Design a protein around this ligand. Structure first.
Ligand SMILES: *[C@H](C)[C@H]1/C(=C/c2[nH]c(/C=C3N=C(/C=C4\NC(=O)C(CC)=C4C)C(C)=C\3CCC(=O)O)c(CCC(=O)O)c2C)NC(=O)[C@@H]1C
Ligand SMILES: *[C@H](C)[C@H]1/C(=C/c2[nH]c(/C=C3N=C(/C=C4\NC(=O)C(CC)=C4C)C(C)=C\3CCC(=O)O)c(CCC(=O)O)c2C)NC(=O)[C@@H]1C
Lengths: 309, 306
């Protein structure tokens, strides 16, 4: 049941908007319902729209040029400007067979001159983290995980950061934790397997970093071309809305916002666990920082697998 | 020392402005800056020009904020009429804020963040390969460093150049494109690298020369400025004429040099030296990534001695 509704991914979070394009025609074959408002000035946006009508000439050309690379050759994000408004967005591209799917995340105008500076700064901080993991003496899973949650806490600014390990019966245990002062600790607690369905663990193998900005936000529908006789697969989107059971789960534990990083060993390939960030209030972090976190989690996974041996 | 610090020439691949640390107005500029930044009241660019007349408002605001600091480089700026974009690289000296401007292709502006992330990722992967090395073999450590830099930077030749106790140098590792003659193993006199150059490398850890044959450009300053403006910290500083000549005879038209400073007790261990047969330019984000790679390399060198 869970996998169907997560794979189709027809509901997104409202912090961004989504377009899907036909690789052959470059025209819009699906869009989220908030996309006309975000990207135009309400020359419309609908099924069949050409993207050269929406963005400035260098922007349209950069996206058009992405159509011609293999996915492993995609460099994200792309900085685009809207043609009428001048509004800037980060465009995050991925491919599913003959479709190109694009997530658009807003950028503040005063942030634009700092886009390269901020990207370098995020990766530099992550790189300094990697050196401290590596400097650590071997022999203690506990010290390794403490160092990791401490580094992530400083890098990401969330109220709570946990290392969550899966046991062989698939139930989980919180084995390391750092929080801001007032909060209730979860260190040492065990949780049922069913708190994280099989389908979610499966998706984490491919989508290694997941952000939920606000569990109470009103989700937005994706509309697709009525001519299509199948559903598009949108689960690779950075914007996919959380299933309502989990959004209800979040509100109950006063984690209004979250950032989760998969820890995949032998990347025998196995989901060892998760690094779980919670925030009491809504929180957004831009793509370059999440991208750096993905690499930090990869290196962490190498050290985890070393200690096992 | 006094025609590297008080020498007033830059390489022509970019241009330079210096601004007064209080008024924010132009107190020095390279002779190529008017055509590069305005396309040639008053001559649009001279002593006393206000940066609000040169750049779009978001661009000028971002530079005003930097004068208020802490520095994250580079800043992406657009010129006011042309919309012509540059990377602005900022540093401070006692009297002034100095800005090096390196051009960006207008149609590449959408990919600036993407390219910066990719540069740092490749350097971060190189860092993990150095770390995973079994300790004990200085040869293996240095061979790995030159291989990674070669792949990252795309230069024709990459060598590790070690300083001996008498300050003479030795090439102890090297990788080149096929068919180039090796220099591995050669010893060179201490005088090839004067002490003044060594002292600069302590502060400016990455130095790029795009084309030893390029015609250098003068920096003009107000003659009543109560101090002498130094260019030691500019990414654009011209090579000394002895070295421009030294490079031509050895068919290194372009170079990229990384200092290797241990106990960063502080001493210059050596250099990672990249050479190219033809002119070569690499953008600031890649040089910035190389700086961190060089610091991490220095730590492993220091470990090997001990
Ligand atoms: C509804 C009947 C059942 C249900 C479904 C469900 N859960 C998830 C996803 C996650 N569940 C967790 C669990 C935890 N988070 C924590 O912080 C802790 C320790 C305090 C636990 C145990 C996590 C981390 C996830 C991943 C969330 C993410 O991707 O950010 C899903 C998938 C949701 C989606 O839309 O991707 C579903 C469907 N949960 C229940 O408890 C019910 C039994
Ligand atoms: C002129 C009278 C003397 C002189 C001066 C001089 N040298 C440098 C700087 C450098 N010299 C070297 C030397 C080498 N490069 C190599 O590739 C090799 C081995 C194959 C050697 C021995 C290097 C690497 C530098 C640094 C250059 C840089 O910053 O990119 C300077 C500094 C130039 C400047 O303006 O910074 C000067 C003045 N060289 C001679 O040979 C004379 C004896």
């Amino acid at each position: 049941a869970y996998l169907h509704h997560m794979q189709k991914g027809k509901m997104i979070q409202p912090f961004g908007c989504l377009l899907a394009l036909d690789e052959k025609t470059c025209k819009v074959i699906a869009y989220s319902e908030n996309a006309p408002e975000m990207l135009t000035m309400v020359p419309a946006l609908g099924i069949g729209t050409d993207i050269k009508t929406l963005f400035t000439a260098p922007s349209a050309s950069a996206l058009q040029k992405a159509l011609g690379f293999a996915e492993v050759l995609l460099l994200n994000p792309v900085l685009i400007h809207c043609k009428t408004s001048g509004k800037p967005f980060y465009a995050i591209i991925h491919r599913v067979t003959g479709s190109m799917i694009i997530d658009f995340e807003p950028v503040k105008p005063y942030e634009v001159p700092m886009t390269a500076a901020g990207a370098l700064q995020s990766y530099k901080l992550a790189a300094k983290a990697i050196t401290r993991l590596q400097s650590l003496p071997s022999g203690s899973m506990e010290r390794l995980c403490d160092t990791m949650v401490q580094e992530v806490f400083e890098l990401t600014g969330y109220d709570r950061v946990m290392a969550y390990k899966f046991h062989e019966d698939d139930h989980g245990e919180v084995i390391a934790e750092i929080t801001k002062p007032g909060l209730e600790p979860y260190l040492g607690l065990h949780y049922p397997a069913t708190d994280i369905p099989q389908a979610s663990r499966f998706l984490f193998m491919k989508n290694k970093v997941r952000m939920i900005v606000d569990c109470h936000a009103k989700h937005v529908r994706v509309l697709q071309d009525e001519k299509l006789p199948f559903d598009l697969t949108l689960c690779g989107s950075t914007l996919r809305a959380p299933h309502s059971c989990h959004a209800q789960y979040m509100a109950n534990m006063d984690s209004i916002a979250s950032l989760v990083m998969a820890v995949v060993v032998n990347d025998r390939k196995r989901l060892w666990g998760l690094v779980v960030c919670h925030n009491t209030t809504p929180r957004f972090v831009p793509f370059p920082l999440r991208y750096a976190c993905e690499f930090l989690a990869q290196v962490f996974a190498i050290h985890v697998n070393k200690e096992i041996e």
